[PDB]
Amino acid sequence: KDMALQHAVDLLEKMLADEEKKLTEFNLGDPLFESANDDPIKTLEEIIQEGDDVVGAHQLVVTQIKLRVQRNRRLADEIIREQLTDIRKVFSDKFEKLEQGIQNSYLLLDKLKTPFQDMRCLFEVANEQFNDTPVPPQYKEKFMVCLKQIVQYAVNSSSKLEKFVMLKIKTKKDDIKDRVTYTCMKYLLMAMQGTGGPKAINNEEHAKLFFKQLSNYDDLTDANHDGLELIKKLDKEQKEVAFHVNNFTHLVTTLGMALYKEGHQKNDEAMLGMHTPITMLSDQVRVLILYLIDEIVHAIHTNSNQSNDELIDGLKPKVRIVINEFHATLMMGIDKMKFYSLNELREIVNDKI
Amino acid sequence: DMALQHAVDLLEKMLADEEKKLTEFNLGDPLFEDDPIKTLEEIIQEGDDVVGAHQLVVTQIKLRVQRNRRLADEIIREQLTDIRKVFSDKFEKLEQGIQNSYLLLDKLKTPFQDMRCLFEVANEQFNDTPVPPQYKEKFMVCLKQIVQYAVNSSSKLEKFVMLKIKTKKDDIKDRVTYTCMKYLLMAMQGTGGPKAINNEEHAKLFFKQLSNYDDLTDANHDGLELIKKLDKEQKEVAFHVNNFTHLVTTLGMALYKEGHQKNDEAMLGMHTPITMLSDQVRVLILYLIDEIVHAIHTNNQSNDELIDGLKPKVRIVINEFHATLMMGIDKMKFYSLNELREIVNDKIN
């Protein structure tokens, strides 16, 4: 589909669905039937007030433990299920925010190409340098005529510089989308890896052992005593549940937070990454105009015999060479910011010729 | 000993080297001496003397080009300190981040030193396990012992856990120190300025063609244009300072956010393993309780017989934890008491 992070969103769905399925499965040791006993849970007070005799107390204590083990396991199961619900909530919200932010980064990145559209900046920089270049008056018109034509030739020959900018921009767009997607998937795995709460619950095991040794109690006042103490503990906070709730909440929150940042992070990686190439090419454009201007005035001075056409013509290969040189340099993607001097351009041109 | 010590070194190294190549901003004392640079206003009042004004014009151009060069360097000189201030601050903050994390990883392993936690869980589960008072003694005797065995039989498990926290401490210093350098370069690889200067190129052309001006007033006029532009340049130094400040700040934040994000990812990587290991310890204990009670409540055996019987089951379980822990988090799990039985049964045969 058309979401930048569509793969992340798909994987979130699949994992939750699979996990939600594993919750209802039957695993070894599970009873054939879970107990859903109707009768209401009575408070410790009520049990104390109703247990006149040691045998009536026992009846009351056993059943009230069983009702409570039932209640506690249900709430524990609910909490296991809410882990998945919480993962859906936190990661859906983070993906939506991340997606809205990737879309903005796309725009931002595309704004970087406008000066280079049809390499229109050559015209604008030529306009400026033409106004600021001093030229003895008797040379101005020829300077003008020849500069116009060779700048226009330069525009027509610099298609690869514009196509480079567009390639780089597209690369950063795809970088952002791939990197954020990978991070999204990574955090999602780490989240699903933390699910599953506790399985064994202390007080439930204690009840299981209690009910095992019910026959081995010589004195029913003793059996009642342990039973009542087990009731108190079954109404207290389940420590292992508390431990795992706080741990899982720390895990998902932190994953959540580490991800909210992520899009602004890859956004900035992209904009920072465009800094050197755009800056180098902007400088190259300027330096090209300056080199063309010096060549032209030097030719005008030193070779008044040849026509405008023959002057312009001798410059065309020099134009092609510099543009080629600029392009190879930018393609190298060094990220070491390199600028050219005119003297550097002349040596490169004087070599190829 | 600072964990990010190499980052800091490389910071002072690079700044220093870059600073060497800069030219001094203030001119020394002239052999023959007052400010040599004269205002636009002053140069204008010279203009009745065309030859006089011409000579003053070419001189003031050449002085302004050298002035503007010195400014260019004064720009970088103000930059390298912005790099220093930003990146010192972030290196310090990141370093504090690492030292904190060092303490948190130490915290994580403390329960497992000498596997002390096995005693603590045993205490709590003991106190809470219901048992007839005429068997309470048999329960206590058999539990204290077999838990002590479990502690003694877990030394290879323990040493592995410590090693994994040790390895993770080393991995944090290395990842964050990478992030620090990668971003130091960008602040460096992206400092300086262009080689070809517009006004300098214009000036060079002017002088190239000065002899072809038939009429000095044309030359004088062009020269004054050049001087105005050279002065506009000198007045744009702040703009390039600010722009590079914005740039370094952004590099600094992305530096901080990445070092931090890397730090937190390594800690979270330990979190769930540690959460499962602590649960596995608790389930082991509950499993030992259950065994003992089953073997006491039903089946004419002694404590030694019972306890002897439990030792192979213990080591099987601890080995199971150890083995899954080595395979990694994908092979690690929370256990039911009956999955321990399952495992213990499966291995014996």
Residue numbers in the entry:
A (entry chain A): 40 to 392
B (entry chain B): 41 to 73, 77 to 342, 344 to 393
Structure paper excerpt:
In addition to its effects on the innate immune system, IE1 is required to overcome the PML-NB-mediated intrinsic immunity that targets HCMV immediately upon infection. We show that this IE1CORE domain binds with high affinity to PML via the coiled-coil domain.
Crystallization trials with full-length hIE1 remained unsuccessful and, in case of the IE1CORE variants, yielded suitable crystals only for rhIE1CORE after chemical methylation of surface exposed lysine residues. The structure of rhIE1CORE was solved using experimental phases and refined to 2.3 Å resolution (Rwork = 19.73%, Rfree = 24.96%). RhIE1CORE adopts an elongated, femur-like shape with dimensions of 130×25×25 Å3. RhIE1CORE forms a dimer with C2 point group symmetry in the crystal, and oligomerization of rhIE1 and hIE1 was confirmed both by gel filtration experiments and co-immunoprecipitation analyses (hIE1). RhIE1CORE dimerizes with both stalk regions juxtaposed in an antiparallel fashion. The main-chain conformation differs in the two monomers (Cα-RMSD for all helical segments  = 2.13 Å). This deviation originates from a pronounced kink that is observed in one of the two monomers and that causes a repositioning of the loop that interconnects helices H8 to H9 with a concomitant displacement of the N-terminal half of helix H9.
